[PDB]
Amino acid sequence: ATCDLASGFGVGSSLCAAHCIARRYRGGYCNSKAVCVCRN
């Protein structure tokens, strides 16, 4: 869920990043703490 990857399998939900985009943020990279630090 979210941007959790753990060992590895592919890409997470990416909802967090998209959510940021659909607001004002340019995007957001999913850091390895499922924080998905977005950026304007």
Side-chain angles (χ1 to χ4, degrees), residues 5-25:
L5 298 178
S7 187
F9 60 80
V11 64
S13 312
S14 305
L15 295 175
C16 176
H19 222 292
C20 294
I21 302 175
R23 163 161 42 165
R24 62 180 301 184
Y25 299 68

Side-chain angles (χ1 to χ4, degrees), residues 15-40:
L15 295 175
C16 176
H19 222 292
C20 294
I21 302 175
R23 163 161 42 165
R24 62 180 301 184
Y25 299 68
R26 185 69 183 293
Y29 61 85
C30 299
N31 56 326
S32 46
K33 288 192 300 180
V35 182
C36 43
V37 194
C38 295
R39 40 178 54 185
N40 301 66

